[PDB]
Amino acid sequence: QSKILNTGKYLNIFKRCTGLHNFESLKEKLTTITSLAAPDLELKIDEFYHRANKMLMKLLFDGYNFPSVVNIFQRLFLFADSFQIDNFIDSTFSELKRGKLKISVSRLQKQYDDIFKEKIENKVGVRPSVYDVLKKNQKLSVTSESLYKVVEELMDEPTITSVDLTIPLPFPLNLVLNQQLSYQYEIMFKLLINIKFISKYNSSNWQEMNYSKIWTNSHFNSSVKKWILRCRVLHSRICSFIHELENYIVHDVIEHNFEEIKNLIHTTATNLATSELGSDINDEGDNIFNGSLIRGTFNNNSIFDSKVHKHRTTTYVEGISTVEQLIQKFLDYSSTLLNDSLLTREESLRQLRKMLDFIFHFNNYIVQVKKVLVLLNHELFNEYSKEDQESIDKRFANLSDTFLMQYEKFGENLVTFLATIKQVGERENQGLLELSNRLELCF
Amino acid sequence: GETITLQVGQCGNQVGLQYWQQLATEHGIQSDGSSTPRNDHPELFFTLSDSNTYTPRSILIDMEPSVIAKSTSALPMFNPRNVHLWINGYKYGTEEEETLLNLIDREVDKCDNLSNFQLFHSVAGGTGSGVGSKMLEVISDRYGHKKLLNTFSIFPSVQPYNTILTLKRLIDYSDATFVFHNDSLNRIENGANKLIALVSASVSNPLRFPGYMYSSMESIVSNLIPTPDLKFLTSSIAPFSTQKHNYLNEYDMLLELSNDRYKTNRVGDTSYISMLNYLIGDNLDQREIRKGILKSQQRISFVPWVARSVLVVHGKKSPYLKNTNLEGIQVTNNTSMIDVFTKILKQFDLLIKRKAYLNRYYSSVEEENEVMEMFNESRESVKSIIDEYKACKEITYLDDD
Amino acid sequence: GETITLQVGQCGNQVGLQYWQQLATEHGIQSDGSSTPYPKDINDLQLQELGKYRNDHPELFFTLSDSNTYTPRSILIDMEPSVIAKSTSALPMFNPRNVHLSNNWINGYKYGTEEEETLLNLIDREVDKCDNLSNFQLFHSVAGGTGSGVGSKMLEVISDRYGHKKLLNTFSIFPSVVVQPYNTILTLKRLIDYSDATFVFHNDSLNRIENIGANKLIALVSASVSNPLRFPGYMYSSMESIVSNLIPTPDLKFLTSSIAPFSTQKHNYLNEYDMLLELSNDRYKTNRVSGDTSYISMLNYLIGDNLDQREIRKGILKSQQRISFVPWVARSVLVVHGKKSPYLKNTNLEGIQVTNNTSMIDVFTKILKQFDLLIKENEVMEMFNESRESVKSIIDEYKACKEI
Amino acid sequence: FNESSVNISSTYLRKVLQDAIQISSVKNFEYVDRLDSRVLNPQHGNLGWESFTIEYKIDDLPMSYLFEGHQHLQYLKMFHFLWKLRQLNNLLNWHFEMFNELNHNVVTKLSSRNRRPLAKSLSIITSIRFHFTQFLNELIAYLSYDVIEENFQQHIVRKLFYNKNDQDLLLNKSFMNLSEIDPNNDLPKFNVNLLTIDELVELHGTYIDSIINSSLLNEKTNISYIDQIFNILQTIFNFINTSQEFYSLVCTFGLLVQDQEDLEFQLHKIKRKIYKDIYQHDYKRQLNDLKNDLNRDYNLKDLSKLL
Amino acid sequence: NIATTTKSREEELNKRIVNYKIQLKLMKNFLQELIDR
Amino acid sequence: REEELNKRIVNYKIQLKLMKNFLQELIDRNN
């Protein structure tokens, strides 16, 4: 039943896409099913299904350039080329960190289109590139469903938590890049944008902490100097932790899994390049008649079909040969990306959410600290005031307890996070185990 | 963001010529600035005209026209408008402050979003070292601290006075200073500018050939400078490449990149403050890199208060270089800086107690007092950085006791 | 596991060059490091009308680079560059990085001590390329000058730098001049202290076998000892397992080897049964052995295609009675069914026998007597006394081995 | 494998298998993909060594339907026995390495006063280990090159490729004219005996049965050979476990240089236990009984002389 | 007891559930878009 | 323990089938 339905659908897709009314141009020799009681009905169905797959595969790969669509999706969604998104974050850093409702939504669209979907036109008759076609399709919009809420279903906050990217696709490409696959890609986009943004917040804060006039001032007393030194070291620890986490997520999960699909798709492209379009099917005179009718209720051979199993398919020999495997490979890849990342379990997701929240709030606290340090030292307070000992002692005492609280909170979060990764990696995921080893060897 | 290169002195100009030749070769830009048949981003280092010509962003500064003439003739695509022609040199730099300030402001206006200033200069360059020392001051003053500076200073192999005077401003104003020694460079070779050019070109590889990560200089530098005091970096290069008997795997690159003989500065026992390894090949096997990272973390001695993380960037090789085998660069932050700084201070004290050549600098009583106070300040700053690097080694660094 | 080979001295380099050429020939690795496609298996029968795949383990010795080029795990240590130049020219595959270039034993020992850091860095570099290291192999001459002192210092350095956690073999070659006996005893002292299993080769007995060069026989024996490791089979396949089967106590560690010469002459051995009996002959042992000898352990190597099991069983049964076993060791004879390399066209069998007998009493007695005759700062004389006492410590032990 | 069978998870098994594939020579094997490890019965009282089994996946081929589960179960039983034997063979190698290293690290550097007794005890221990290694090697050699290899060459190679000469093949029908040939020259002659489906099943079943039900491995002093062999294996296990205690005591003796006398007394006690009970009282007695048992059989007399 | 195997059983089941949670929610969104018109 | 995951899997299979049947009912009625 599945073979019949899918053969017919695939031929219908081909006709509707390339515009042919019928397959006369191919001039292939075809054999029709002579009777329902014929013995080769299964063979004929298999041959027709293989013909339909052959045509639709060559359409998608050779004609619709699917291999390049895979690289385009990789770039746009998983940042295989991070230069453009880095410029985007740099250009709108002040906006993205503001609460959802406290900023104009319509501005982000434009500030994204100037970066990504810029264009230079080409003369009539010059073929557009597939990247050219898909650039203008994409749309980035703010959504009400935050990452930590949308991911909880498939088990204000700053705008970064709620910025999404969607890419409608041409027919028939959207049939292989099914909406379920694009949704799993979108989740990864949101996660990676969160981590990229925090890394951009960790670099800017590192620039001020080291070279801004207030922080770099030499005229502080010894106590404030040691406080600054402790804060710088703690921020360095946070920076290293975030870079390690991002490295794992992006190289140890995305690129490593993508290598397999890239190799397979290249092999399939090379296989189809040398393959003609349309296959000839021949048959004999089939004189069996009564020796094949087997009329009645049925034969007792139905038991063998159920007895056998077809769960053994591997080695991806000669690349992908059926569109169903083509879709299945990408679905498995997306499921692997979600499962490896710390978003599938409840313990891992909760620990990740606490860690990211703590880092973001620590950066905000660092920003608010800059104001306080003005009052402590005198040499720069006079300059900034142009536009008491007890009070200064109180200010420093308050900063002591606040900074100690942040320091101990970091220690607690780190311990819990490492324990959670260790248990999950030992139980289910191999990739998380080596990350646990690396992080344990760090601290 | 875009970067601006500053070349000062004869050694700086020669190193810059090699550096720009390497960069143009990597991006396929011809000597005349014409393109050769994009995913890479040379715009961060070259200005693109609407007539399809690439010209370097660098600024050439030298006391004599012979070196600049050789550099410009070798690479015709240099813009002549950017060409300009110890204490005496620094006072000369004061006179030309307006012209140089406007000259640099032209490049800053020409770019869209400035990121950092690169500086190629020699500490032991005499007069040119003075003009570069003034360049750092004027740039840091006018542009504040929002834009950071990177100095690829070449250390020395009367010189002690010049080295101390240049190192005072190098400590004060630079944000991330590489250290190169001609001694270790010629030891590795057993010309020398081709190693410095290669290291500097590879340091920015993740910017010009983007990948998943490390898309900005802030990310590259912030991983290596926990404190603004400890700003000196030690760079290591693996020389065994392009031979038949080259490293069998990237894992052996990670293990053998840490050898002390390949480091570009004289080293005994050292403690590493931060690490970052460059691997640049068309295809890189992940599992080898994971094994190498684990071994490197278990083998290297980090200081107690550092997170103890080793970062490996997966650089991409240029399409214009044909199928060459893997190569890699290592940039580290060690406590070995105390040895070289102590050597410089010992030479300076030995030659300051003996009034050997101070007559060339002390012109009168007021000049004597000026030079004495300047020298004292420089010596105190160098001692301060030595004491800071020494206090980093011990375990009570974070304690208030 | 992996094995690292170290060659010290002119004689050691001469032996090692042919040893590595032998291994390269067996594994089909050309002199330039290029690999040869593996021929189809012979006993893997297939139906008939009427590239990287392998089933051996060459990488146990050669480092397989990312470009499909092999390179030996060898380290060449000496002072005269002529032998190294000849070795490298013969085998360009040798890594130039692995070569180190610089009569009295004391002078060589002190030179090794002064320059120990560089050699140690080289050893660590070679180890870093090895995962799960197993053992070290040393090719050096007990007497001869550079080899004695440099090999002794390297022995001590390797023994104490890794905590003795890996066994360390020794393919020592004994000499057949006033300084030679001193060198022999001084090196044998460290062989007793550090080495885990020593293959004693005597040049005079090697000349006795040859006339029926001398380094080719040593290379053949050394390259045939590790046949089970490079072509894994049911038993052994590990260097520790082979050695552990012949060394009952740490003191009785000195092994000797017997070689069947007639691997190529057209009057070769008829079958496995004949060769099993011929291997026990005392005229083809590499160490002079008398009729009063007694064997502590037995191990026979057979290398051929589809050996007949009946012949091997009958040969073992007949040879068990002939051999005079030590009273406290159970009568046990073991035969290794090695696999011939498919690259070799020669179909004739080869067989090497490795034994741990009590003939070492006479050999060390000759060495001791010559040393005593020659003896007739002060620190060196104390070391001479210590070497004399250490050698006697196993002379009397091998004598006591006779007793229950 | 040290921890209980319930603690071992799938990811650790996969890591172990992949590391072992990379280390060994199977990484170049043609069908390295088909290899897969598993744990059969994760009971609390079973350690890793008593449950690990290597499984060769042939499910992707129709051949798997010919090979019924009973044959595979008999392939996993014989593997279990051989796995125990090789586990002990390798444990003795680790014992040899650790004691040899300890000899150089502690005993030879100890004070000359008590060096001699410790040297004697260590030599005794190592000689006992050597005896056990010889016995295990002889047993493995006999099984491998007289049971598995002979049965393979006799029941598989000689059934498939060599002629199954029979009384009907004896008759040369060409005394009849028989000029004609059928069905056609297009039908190949295939260098292998044409076997029916039931014939293939029976062939592989007999090949497995011959090995599992060999003379030594059958269930037939009113005790079977397998029980005696397993008793000797238990003796070797006890020897290893006690030698570890001796290792710890001697290293504690090395660290010391009134406690010296106590440690020396404990060393003498351990040496007495291992030398007398385990070896003299148990191993030699069991081996004597086994050797006498084997001589009653014509087939195993030759093995008895060696083993 | 059920046999242990190198492949993570619980991981496979969990991935199936997550893939069944994506299909359900996408179908719900589509039905909401369909009903409100 | 994994029985519980299988039970939830089958429950979601039924829920998905119900949703698809709802789509078919709605489309049939609108036509």
Residue numbers in the entry:
A (entry chain J): 375 to 529, 573 to 804, 814 to 869
B (entry chain I): 3 to 39, 73 to 120, 131 to 202, 211 to 243, 262 to 338, 340 to 473
C (entry chain B): 3 to 52, 70 to 121, 129 to 202, 209 to 244, 262 to 425, 440 to 467
D (entry chain D): 462 to 681, 687 to 723, 736 to 785
E (entry chain K): 231 to 267
F (entry chain L): 239 to 269
What does the paper say about this structure?
The γ-tubulin ring complex (γ-TuRC) is a structural template for controlled nucleation of microtubules from α/β-tubulin heterodimers. The exposed γ-tubulin molecules recruit α/β-tubulin heterodimers by interacting with the α-tubulin subunits, thereby realising the function of γ-TuCs as structural templates for MT nucleation. For ascomycete yeasts, MT nucleation occurs mainly from oligomers of the compositionally much simpler γ-tubulin small complex (γ-TuSC). Whereas the CM1 motif of CDK5RAP2 binds to pre-assembled γ-TuRCs in vertebrates, the CM1-containing receptor proteins Spc110 and Spc72 promote oligomerisation of yeast γ-TuSC on the nuclear and cytoplasmic side of the SPB, respectively.
Here, we determine the cryo-EM structure of the Candida albicans cytoplasmic nucleation unit at 3.6 Å resolution, revealing how the γ-TuRC is assembled and conformationally primed for microtubule nucleation by the dimerised Spc72 CM1 motif. As the MT nucleation unit comprises higher oligomers of structurally identical γ-TuSCs, two complementary data processing strategies were pursued: in the first branch, all γ-TuSC units were treated as individual asymmetric units, resolving the structure of the γ-TuSC unit within higher oligomers to 3.6 Å, which was sufficient to build and refine a full atomic model of γ-TuSC components. Comparing the models of non-oligomerised and oligomerised γ-TuSCs revealed extensive conformational changes within the γ-TuSC unit. While the N-terminal parts of GRIP1 domains are structurally unaffected by oligomerisation (residues 91-308: Cα RMSD 1.86 Å (Spc97), residues 150-306: Cα RMSD 1.42 Å (Spc98)), the C-terminal parts undergo a hinge-like rigid-body rotation that guides the GRIP2 domains and the associated γ-tubulins into a MT-compatible conformation, in which the γ-tubulin molecules are in much closer proximity as compared to the isolated γ-TuSC. This conformational change is accompanied by remodelling of an ascomycete yeast-specific extended interface between the GRIP2 domains and the formation of an additional interface between the γ-tubulin molecules on both spokes, primarily electrostatic in nature. Upon oligomerisation, an interface forms between adjacent C. albicans γ-TuSC units. Our high-resolution cryo-EM reconstruction of the γ-TuSC unit within higher oligomers displayed density to the amino acid side chain level for two α-helices forming a coiled-coil on the outer surface of the Spc97 GRIP2 domain. For both α-helices, ModelAngelo predicted a sequence highly similar to the CM1 motif of Spc72, revealing that the CM1 motif of Spc72 binds as a parallel dimeric coiled coil, comparable to human CDK5RAP221, but, surprisingly, different from monomeric CM1 binding in budding yeast Spc110 10.
